[PDB]
Write an enzyme that holds these catalytic residues in place. Structure first.
Site, PDB file in Angstrom:
ATOM      1  CG  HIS B  69      22.994 -15.630  14.223  1.00 32.92           C
ATOM      2  ND1 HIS B  69      21.781 -14.972  14.156  1.00 32.92           N
ATOM      3  CD2 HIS B  69      23.327 -15.665  15.537  1.00 32.92           C
ATOM      4  CE1 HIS B  69      21.392 -14.638  15.375  1.00 32.92           C
ATOM      5  NE2 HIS B  69      22.314 -15.045  16.232  1.00 32.92           N
ATOM      6  CG  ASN B 141      18.953 -11.824  18.023  1.00 29.04           C
ATOM      7  OD1 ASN B 141      19.344 -12.185  16.904  1.00 29.04           O
ATOM      8  ND2 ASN B 141      19.470 -12.310  19.152  1.00 29.04           N
TER       9      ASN B 141
HETATM   10  C1  HEM Z   1      27.759 -13.146  24.881  1.00 29.76           C
HETATM   11  C2  HEM Z   1      26.803 -13.461  24.006  1.00 29.76           C
HETATM   12  C3  HEM Z   1      27.077 -13.602  22.499  1.00 29.76           C
HETATM   13  C4  HEM Z   1      28.223 -13.912  21.859  1.00 29.76           C
HETATM   14  C5  HEM Z   1      29.593 -14.296  22.452  1.00 29.76           C
HETATM   15  C6  HEM Z   1      27.949 -13.873  20.440  1.00 29.76           C
HETATM   16  C7  HEM Z   1      28.840 -14.159  19.427  1.00 29.76           C
HETATM   17  C8  HEM Z   1      28.531 -14.210  18.083  1.00 29.76           C
HETATM   18  C9  HEM Z   1      29.465 -14.518  17.027  1.00 29.76           C
HETATM   19  C10 HEM Z   1      30.949 -14.821  17.273  1.00 29.76           C
HETATM   20  C11 HEM Z   1      28.815 -14.474  15.860  1.00 29.76           C
HETATM   21  C12 HEM Z   1      29.386 -14.735  14.452  1.00 29.76           C
HETATM   22  C13 HEM Z   1      29.861 -13.407  13.867  1.00 29.76           C
HETATM   23  C14 HEM Z   1      30.601 -13.591  12.563  1.00 29.76           C
HETATM   24  O1  HEM Z   1      31.354 -14.582  12.386  1.00 29.76           O
HETATM   25  O2  HEM Z   1      30.424 -12.721  11.678  1.00 29.76           O
HETATM   26  C15 HEM Z   1      27.437 -14.128  16.142  1.00 29.76           C
HETATM   27  C16 HEM Z   1      26.435 -13.948  15.213  1.00 29.76           C
HETATM   28  C17 HEM Z   1      25.328 -13.164  15.435  1.00 29.76           C
HETATM   29  N1  HEM Z   1      24.880 -12.745  16.689  1.00 29.76           N
HETATM   30 FE1  HEM Z   1      25.706 -13.187  18.464  1.00 29.76          FE
HETATM   31  N2  HEM Z   1      26.633 -13.500  20.252  1.00 29.76           N
HETATM   32  C18 HEM Z   1      26.070 -13.308  21.497  1.00 29.76           C
HETATM   33  C19 HEM Z   1      24.765 -12.927  21.738  1.00 29.76           C
HETATM   34  C20 HEM Z   1      23.999 -12.242  20.828  1.00 29.76           C
HETATM   35  C21 HEM Z   1      22.949 -11.282  21.117  1.00 29.76           C
HETATM   36  C22 HEM Z   1      22.492 -10.901  22.549  1.00 29.76           C
HETATM   37  C23 HEM Z   1      22.470 -10.851  19.929  1.00 29.76           C
HETATM   38  C24 HEM Z   1      21.375  -9.804  19.618  1.00 29.76           C
HETATM   39  C25 HEM Z   1      21.114  -8.780  20.445  1.00 29.76           C
HETATM   40  C26 HEM Z   1      23.228 -11.508  18.885  1.00 29.76           C
HETATM   41  C27 HEM Z   1      23.024 -11.346  17.542  1.00 29.76           C
HETATM   42  C28 HEM Z   1      23.743 -11.952  16.541  1.00 29.76           C
HETATM   43  C29 HEM Z   1      23.407 -11.848  15.148  1.00 29.76           C
HETATM   44  C30 HEM Z   1      22.231 -11.090  14.523  1.00 29.76           C
HETATM   45  C31 HEM Z   1      24.450 -12.648  14.408  1.00 29.76           C
HETATM   46  C32 HEM Z   1      24.525 -12.810  12.888  1.00 29.76           C
HETATM   47  C33 HEM Z   1      25.113 -11.516  12.330  1.00 29.76           C
HETATM   48  C34 HEM Z   1      25.068 -11.668  10.843  1.00 29.76           C
HETATM   49  O3  HEM Z   1      23.953 -11.728  10.291  1.00 29.76           O
HETATM   50  O4  HEM Z   1      26.140 -11.752  10.211  1.00 29.76           O
HETATM   51  N3  HEM Z   1      24.153 -12.350  19.461  1.00 29.76           N
HETATM   52  N4  HEM Z   1      27.293 -13.971  17.510  1.00 29.76           N
END
Ligand code: HEM
Ligand SMILES: NC(=O)C1=CN([C@@H]2O[C@H](COP(=O)(O)OP(=O)(O)OC[C@H]3O[C@@H](n4cnc5c(N)ncnc54)[C@H](OP(=O)(O)O)[C@@H]3O)[C@@H](O)[C@H]2O)C=CC1
Ligand SMILES: NC(=O)C1=CN([C@@H]2O[C@H](COP(=O)(O)OP(=O)(O)OC[C@H]3O[C@@H](n4cnc5c(N)ncnc54)[C@H](OP(=O)(O)O)[C@@H]3O)[C@@H](O)[C@H]2O)C=CC1
Ligand SMILES: NC(=O)C1=CN([C@@H]2O[C@H](COP(=O)(O)OP(=O)(O)OC[C@H]3O[C@@H](n4cnc5c(N)ncnc54)[C@H](OP(=O)(O)O)[C@@H]3O)[C@@H](O)[C@H]2O)C=CC1
Ligand code: HEM
Ligand code: HEM
Ligand SMILES: [Cl-]
Ligand SMILES: [Cl-]
Lengths: 514, 514, 515
Positions: B69, B141
Site C-alpha cells: 500500500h 479495503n
Molecule cells: C495477515 C494479513 C495482513 C498483514 C500482515 C498486513 C500488513 C500490513 C502492513 C504491515 C501494512 C503497512 C502499515 C504501515 O506501515 O503503516 C499494511 C498496509 C495496509 N493494509 Fe494490510 N495486511 C494484511 C491484510 C490486510 C487486509 C485483510 C486488509 C483490509 C481488510 C488490509 C488493509 C491494508 C490497508 C488499507 C493498508 C494501507 C493503510 C494506509 O493507507 O496507510 N491489509 N498491511
C-alpha cells in the site's frame, strides 16, 4: 557467456537450496502455510516463532529510495581500452590494453520507485569501474550539460520537479516558476524539451560525465577533460504522445528492455571518448570551461577515442546489487581529478552523505560496493559491521606498528614540526582562484557567457525543422496548467532562447489552452 | 468552511513566514543561490554552513514506503452517528448523536510510491476516528473479502504481487503460480479481475472492514459485526484498457481527483452500515464466519444503518499528515473487539511493528497519530522523543505515587497472591476454541466451506452478461506471459470457480496468445 | 597456537593483516592521515578533502544503541562436549552422544550502561550460543536459577526501576525498593541478589542457569520438562559488598579483563552441563507450580543429571563485531527442544529478535557471528544492508512451481487448503492442560506451596550458613540507604515475610547505619 564482472556479481550469493525452508537461525520451518493457534478456532499464539520472523522481516524490506534518481535499473560489464591515452592520464584503468569490470545504473530523475521509465526526464547514466587502484565512478547523465551552476540551488530544482507540499501532486506552475526564475536552466531545459527528453531505452542514448574533470599524467601534468559515451545502438526517441502511451502500457519499459537485451545476448556497447582541453586553454576559452551549463564546442575540442564498454551481465539480484549500489562521483582514483565546477564540488560531498543514511554507515562493505583490492582503513564499528580488521591491528595513526598511514606521511609521526606536502593534485591541480577571500561570487566571466546563447545555437544551428517544431510542441504541452502569472515569464524565457521558438511556443500554447 | 478535523490538521503547522530565510538554528541565511568559495574560481569551502545543512537535509527527505500500500493519498472529515446502536456496542464514537473527527487514506497495494493509481489492484480504504476514548482505526479495503485466511501466507502473496528478485520486474507467471497453488485466493481474484479491479476514483467505490469484528455493549454482551461503507457517489469503473490509458496520462489520477473534489466543495460521503450476527448464530452459519475469504450473505444479514462520514478537509501537508499517518487495525477502543480470524490476528501485530521501523519508535507522538485525549504511559525515551511526562513522574508501576496502572489493577501492587481478572473481553469474548492444544489446524469446517463456491455464486447469480464477459476478458489479459507450465493450472482454477467461466477464459486466452 | 572448534566462526569477516599505506573506502590511496587540505596554508578548509569527510563521517557513526538491559558485557568462544547419553530424553542434535559443538558466550550485568562497572551488585547474564548442525541453539541464561517476576507484562517496570529517574538521570534506591516491595513476587530473586552471589568476582567463578522450565522431546515425540544448570569448575567465588565497590572504581572492566587474560594465558574455564528432568506427568502435582520462574525445582526432588561440559578456549578477534553485535535470543531453539507455559519465557521469545531488528538492523542474522553453520533457506528478502542473497532467480514466494521448498509439514506444492490440519505444535511445546477455554488474565495454577516468600525463606533457614545469613542482612541494609520514610516500613515488612529473624536483623543494621 562469461563476464569480467562475474567475480563481483557472485559475491554474497547463496547456492541453490531445496528440501525444506529454515528459520533464520537455521532450524527447520514447520509450515509456510498455517499459523499456530490455541485450538483450531482459538487465538493465534505469540510464540509462532516463524510467523513473527517472517512478518517482521517482511515489514522491514523497504529502505529509503534515492533522492533524486529513485527509479532505475542496471547491469554489469567490461571496459576495454583500445587507444593510448597515457600522455594525458596515469589512471590505471585507462592504460593501454586494460580490461576492467564495471557496473552501470540508468534512471530517471524526478519520479519515485515504480514511476514510469518513460516520463519526460533527464536519464541518469552512472558507471562504476572496479579498477586495480579502487572503484572509479563516473556518475553521468544522458545530457552533456545540466540545469544549474551552483549546488546551493540543487534542492530548489529537485523540489520543483517533485510534488507540492500540500497535496503530493507534481505541478507545471511550480516547474516553470522555478525554471524561468533560474534562467541558467535554459540550456538543459531546451535539451530536455526536445526529442532527447524521451529516449526509448537505456541502450539508445549517449552518456556524458557532463562536468569538466581533470586528467593528470605520470609526470604530474594536468589537462581538463569531458567524458562522452557514444551509443553504438544510436539515439532513438519516442514522441511526447508515444512516451505517455508506453508509460501506461509498461511503466518498466526501459528496465525490461535492458534485461531482455542482455538475456538474449544482444549486449549494448558505447564508445568511450573524451574532449581534452589543455590546461593553458582554459582562461581564454569563449565560454567558462567550468560552468556546467556550458558545453565545450566539439568544433573546438573534437572527441578523442579511448575505448569502449559493453554490458554483458544482468544482476543476480536487483535489490542487493542495483538498489544498494552506491554510485558516487567522489569515487575518484589516481590520474583523475575534479575542477572548479561548483556543482561537481557539491556532489563530491552529497552522494556519500546520502548513502550513509539511505543504506547505512557500512554501505561500503556490501558486495557490490567493495573494490577489488583490500581496503586499509582506521575506520571501525558502525551498524551492521560485517568486515573487520585483522585481530589486534591498531585503531589510530601514527602508531608503533605497521598498518601504515597516508602515502605523503612517514607512518611514524603526526607530521608536526611544520611539515608541508604542497599542492593537492589528487583533488585537482587548481587554476587561478581570481581572489584571495572567501566570497559568494559569479563565475569568472568569459566572452560569450550568458544563460541563453548555447540553447539558441542548438535551436538555430543544430536542430532540423521537425526537431524545432516538436520542441515547441513539447514545451507547449508541458506548459498546460501554469498560472496566468507564470505565462508571460515562460513566454519571455523562450523568446530569450530564440524569438522564433518563443513565438511558436506561445502560438501552440494558446491553441491548446482552448 | 470549518471541519471537526481542524483541531487535528492544524497540529504542528508553522504560521506563514516572509522576509528572508533562516538556517535551522534560526540565524539569517545569506543566500539560497550562490555557495561560498575561496576566490570566485577557487574551491568550495567546507564551512558554507547553510549549503551543507540544505544538502544534508535534502539527502534525508525520503523514508521507507509502506509495504504494501505504498501509493496512496487521503483526507480528513467527520463521522456522524444517525441511528441508535447502543444495544449492540458501548463504543463511544458510535453512541447516538456523536460527531467524530476522522482521517482516511486510500491506496493501491502492489505498486511503489510513484506507481499509477489505476493499475488493476485492490484499493485500501483506511479510516481513523479520533474518539474520546482513543484513536479507533478501521483499516479496510474496497472489497468485502481477501485472498487468504492465514497471515503466515501474507508475505508470500505480497512478494508474488511485487517484483522478481533477479530483475525487478513484476511477473504474470509468478502471480498466477501463487494464486492457483493457493486456491483460497479464488474469491478475491474473481472480485479483482472484474470491473471493481479498476474503480475510476477513490470516491466511486465502497469500503469494507472485510474481517468479522466484535461489538460489546455496556452489559458486556457481544455480537459479531462486519463494516460496510456504502458510497453515495456510486461504484464507477474503468475497463481494463481505459485504466491503462489513464495510467499513462495521469499516474496520480485518483489522488488528484480527491484533492480536486474537496477543494471544490464536492465532499464525498459514505453511509456507514454493519452486518450483525448474533453470537449464537456463528457455529451454525453455512460458512465459517471468521474466514476472511467468506462473506456473510446480505440475504442472511442485511445492512443495518449506523451513520455516515464525509470528507471535507484536504491535508495541510501531504507527507507530514498522510505519508506519516500510522493506520493500524490494532487501534481498537472499548466496545470493539477482534475475532478468531487469523488474518486479522496477524495484522494486529504487523502494522505497529512496521510503523516502529518505517517512521520511528516515537511515531505515536507525531501530530496526526496522537489521540485527542492525553496518553498516560510508562513508555519513555527512544529516538526523537518530542513529548515527555510531567517532571519527576514515575517510570514504573506499581509505584507509591499517583500516575496509576491498568483499570483492572489496584494501582498499589503487582496483582500477586493469585489475583485473577477473568475473560479478556477487551480483546474479544471468544467462541469455543474447538480444542485444548497448540495446533496448526484448518478452520472449523462449516457446511458450504470450500475455496470456490462464493466466487461461483457471484458469477452464476450476481454478475450480468457484460460483467461475465469482461471478467473473462480481463482474466485472459492478465494471463498473458504465464509459462506453459502454468497454463493448465490456471485453466483448472477457473473451472473450479465455474465451468462456463473457465471455458471462456481458456477460449479468450488462446485467441490472444500467439 | 591452540586450535578451537570455534575458529571457523571467529575467522568469518576478518581482513588479512595489511601494511603500506591506507586507502579510502573505495580503495584509492590516502594522501594523509595527518593534514587536511586548505585553500592556501592559512586559507579555509576545502569541502572536497574526500578522505577527511569520509574519516569524520564514519567516526560519527561508530556508536549503535546498547542493549536494554544487559548493556555491559563481554564474551568468548569455545566448545560443547557431550559425555553422557541423554538420547532417551531429547533428539536435539547437539546433545547426542559424543557430539562436539562450537559455541559463543556473552556475560554481562543488567542495569548499567556501556561504560559501567562489571562489579556493581547485579544479576549477571550467562548467554550461550551453540552452532549446531540443525541451527543456532541459544540458551540465554543468568547466574541465578530464578528471577524477579512471573509475567513479562511487568518486565519493563522492573528494568526502569533499576535504571535512572526520568528527571535527573540518577539511579535511585527508593525507586528500586518501592518497586520490589510492591511486586513481592520479587522476593526469591532479591534474596539471591542481596547475598554473596550478587557480587561474583569473575565470569568464570559463577554458575549459569537456563532459569526457565524448557521442554525436551525425544525421537519418538515424548516430552519431559527440563531445567539447565551450568556448574562452574572454577567454583563460586564472591566479593563482599565493600570489595566489589572498591573494584568497581579500580577497574570497571575487571571481569572483561579477567576473562580475556584467562583465555590468553591458556587457563580455559569449564562448566559441567547438567539438567533437572521432570516427567511430563509429574507437573500437575508438584508442590510448586513448575512453570513459575520465581519457583526453583528442589534438587532433592529433581537431582542434577550430567550431560557434558563446555570450555571457553577462544577470545573474540574483534570485540565490537563479534560480541557487541552478537544477537543472543532464547527463541533460537532447535528440534528436540521446546518452550513451556512460563509467561516470562513466552514474552522473551518475542522480545529479543524485536530489539535486535532495531539495535543491529533488519539483516542482523546475516552478520558473521549470527549466521548458523548450515545454509539458511528462507523466502525473506531485501531490507537494509542486505549482504547475503539467494541464488539468481530463485522464487520469492511459496507454494511455487520450483524446488526451493516449504515447511516440513507442508507438501511443497500447495497452500494446505482443503481443510488440511497438522495437529499438535510439538516444536513449540507439547502443552499441558490450559485449565480454561477462554482468553483470560489469570493467576498461574495454584500449587500447594505457591506463595512469594517460602522459597527465599527456605534458602535463609535451610541453606545459607551463618556468615551468609549475616552478610545478607548487611548487604540489604546497605542497599536500603537512601530510601524514603514512606518506603522504610514496606521494606521492613518484605524482609519479615521472607523470615522474621532476617527481617529483624535487616532493620537493626539499617537503623545503625542511618542514625
Ligand atoms: C495477515 C494479513 C495482513 C498483514 C500482515 C498486513 C500488513 C500490513 C502492513 C504491515 C501494512 C503497512 C502499515 C504501515 O506501515 O503503516 C499494511 C498496509 C495496509 N493494509 Fe494490510 N495486511 C494484511 C491484510 C490486510 C487486509 C485483510 C486488509 C483490509 C481488510 C488490509 C488493509 C491494508 C490497508 C488499507 C493498508 C494501507 C493503510 C494506509 O493507507 O496507510 N491489509 N498491511
Ligand atoms: N558540445 C557538446 O558536448 C554537445 C552539444 N550539444 C548541443 O549542440 C550545440 C552545439 O554544440 P557543438 O558541439 O558546438 O556543435 P556540433 O554540431 O559539433 O554538435 C552538436 C551536438 O548536438 C547533438 N544533437 C543533435 N540533435 C540533437 C537534439 N535533438 N537534441 C540535443 N542534441 C542534439 C549532436 O548529436 P549528433 O552528432 O548525433 O547529431 C551533436 O553532438 C550546443 O549548444 C549544445 O546545445 C549537444 C550534445 C553534445
Ligand atoms: N455479502 C457481501 O458482504 C458482499 C458479497 N459480494 C459478492 O456477492 C456474492 C453474493 O453475496 P450476497 O450478499 O449473498 O448477495 P447479494 O445479491 O445480496 O449481494 C451481491 C453483492 O455483490 C455486489 N456486486 C455487484 N456487482 C459486482 C461486481 N461487478 N463485482 C463485485 N461485486 C459486485 C453487489 O453490489 P450492488 O448491490 O451495488 O449491486 C452486492 O453488494 C458473494 O458471493 C460475493 O462474492 C460482493 C460485495 C459484498
Ligand atoms: N533448586 C535450585 O535449582 C537452586 C536453588 N537454590 C536455592 O536453594 C533453596 C533450596 O533449594 P533445593 O535445591 O531444594 O536445596 P539444595 O540444598 O539441594 O540446594 C541449595 C542450592 O543453593 C545453593 N547455594 C548455596 N549457597 C548459596 C548462596 N550463598 N546464595 C544462593 N544460593 C546458594 C547451593 O549451592 P552449593 O551446592 O554450591 O552449596 C545449592 O545449589 C531454594 O529455595 C533456592 O533459593 C539455589 C541454587 C539452585
Ligand atoms: C550539485 C548538484 C547535484 C547534487 C547535490 C546531486 C546529488 C545527488 C544525490 C545525493 C544522489 C543520490 C545518490 C545515492 O543515494 O546513491 C544523486 C543521484 C544521481 N545523480 Fe546527482 N546531484 C547533482 C547533480 C547531478 C549531475 C550534474 C549529474 C550528472 C552529471 C547527476 C547524476 C546523478 C545520477 C546518474 C544519480 C543516480 C546514480 C545511480 O544510478 O545510483 N547529478 N544525485
Ligand atoms: C519477560 C522477561 C524478559 C524480557 C522481555 C527480556 C528481554 C531482553 C532483551 C530485549 C534483551 C536485549 C537483547 C538484545 O538486544 O540482544 C535482553 C538481554 C538479556 N536477557 Fe533478558 N529479558 C527478560 C528476562 C530474562 C531472563 C529470565 C533471563 C535469564 C534466564 C534473561 C537473560 C538475559 C541475558 C543473559 C541478556 C543479555 C544477552 C547478551 O549477553 O547479549 N532475561 N533481555
Ligand atoms: Cl545519517
Ligand atoms: Cl525496528
Amino acid at each position: 557467456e562469461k563476464s569480467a564482472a562475474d567475480q563481483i556479481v557472485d559475491r554474497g550469493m547463496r547456492p541453490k537450496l531445496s528440501g525444506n525452508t529454515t528459520r533464520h537461525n537455521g532450524a527447520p520451518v514447520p509450515s509456510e502455510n498455517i499459523s499456530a493457534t490455541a485450538g483450531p478456532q482459538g487465538p493465534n499464539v505469540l510464540n509462532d516463532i516463524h510467523l513473527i520472523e517472517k512478518l517482521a522481516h517482511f515489514n522491514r524490506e523497504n529502505v529509503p529510495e534515492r533522492i533524486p534518481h529513485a527509479k532505475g535499473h542496471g547491469a554489469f560489464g567490461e571496459l576495454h581500452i583500445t587507444e593510448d591515452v597515457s600522455e594525458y592520464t596515469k589512471a590505471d584503468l585507462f592504460q593501454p590494453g586494460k580490461v576492467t569490470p564495471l557496473a552501470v545504473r540508468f534512471s530517471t530523475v524526478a519520479g519515485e520507485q515504480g514511476s514510469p521509465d518513460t516520463w519526460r526526464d533527464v536519464h541518469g547514466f552512472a558507471l562504476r569501474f572496479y579498477t586495480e587502484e579502487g572503484n572509479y565512478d563516473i556518475v553521468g547523465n544522458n545530457t552533456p550539460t545540466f540545469f544549474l551552476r551552483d549546488g546551493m540551488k540543487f534542492p530548489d530544482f529537485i523540489h520543483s520537479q517533485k510534488r507540492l507540499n500540500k497535496n503530493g501532486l507534481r505541478d507545471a506552475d511550480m516547474q516553470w516558476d522555478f525554471w524561468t526564475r533560474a534562467p541558467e536552466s535554459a540550456h538543459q531545459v531546451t535539451y530536455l524539451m526536445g526529442d532527447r527528453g524521451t529516449p526509448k531505452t537505456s541502450r539508445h542514448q549517449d552518456g556524458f560525465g557532463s562536468h569538466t574533470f581533470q586528467w593528470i599524467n605520470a609526470e604530474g601534468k594536468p589537462v581538463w577533460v569531458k567524458y562522452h559515451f557514444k551509443t553504438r545502438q544510436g539515439w532513438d526517441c519516442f514522441t511526447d504522445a508515444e512516451a505517455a502511451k508506453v508509460a501506461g502500457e509498461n511503466a518498466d519499459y526501459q528496465r525490461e528492455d535492458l534485461y531482455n537485451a542482455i538475456e538474449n545476448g544482444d549486449f549494448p556497447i558505447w564508445d568511450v571518448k573524451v574532449q581534452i582541453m589543455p590546461f593553458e586553454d582554459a582562461e581564454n576559452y569563449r565560454w567558462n570551461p567550468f560552468d556546467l551549463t556550458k558545453t565545450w564546442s566539439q568544433k573546438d575540442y573534437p572527441l578523442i577515442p579511448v575505448g569502449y564498454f559493453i554490458l554483458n551481465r544482468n544482476p543476480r539480484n536487483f535489490f542487493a546489487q542495483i538498489e544498494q549500489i552506491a554510485l558516487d562521483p567522489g569515487n575518484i582514483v589516481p590520474g583523475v581529478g575534479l575542477s572548479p565546477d561548483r556543482m561537481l564540488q557539491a556532489r563530491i560531498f552529497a552522494y556519500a552523505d546520502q548513502q550513509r543514511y539511505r543504506i547505512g554507515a557500512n554501505y561500503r562493505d556490501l558486495p557490490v560496493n567493495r573494490p577489488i583490492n583490500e581496503v586499509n582503513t582506521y575506520s571501525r564499528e558502525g551498524s551492521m559491521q560485517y568486515i573487520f580488521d585483522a585481530e589486534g591491528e591498531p585503531s589510530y595513526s601514527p602508531n608503533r606498528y605497521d598498518k601504515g598511514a597516508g602515502y605523503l606521511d612517514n607512518g611514524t609521526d603526526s607530521s608536526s614540526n611544520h611539515t608541508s606536502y604542497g599542492q593537492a593534485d589528487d583533488i585537482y591541480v587548481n587554476p587561478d582562484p581570481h581572489g584571495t577571500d572567501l566570497v559568494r561570487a559569479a563565475y569568472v566571466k568569459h566572452q560569450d557567457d550568458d544563460d541563453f546563447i548555447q540553447p539558441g545555437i542548438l535551436y538555430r544551428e543544430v536542430l532540423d525543422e521537425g526537431e524545432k517544431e516538436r520542441l515547441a510542441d513539447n514545451i507547449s504541452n508541458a506548459m498546460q496548467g501554469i498560472s496566468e502569472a507564470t505565462e508571460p515569464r515562460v513566454y519571455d524565457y523562450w523568446n530569450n532562447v530564440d524569438e522564433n521558438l518563443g513565438a511558436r511556443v506561445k502560438e501552440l500554447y494558446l491553441q491548446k489552452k482552448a
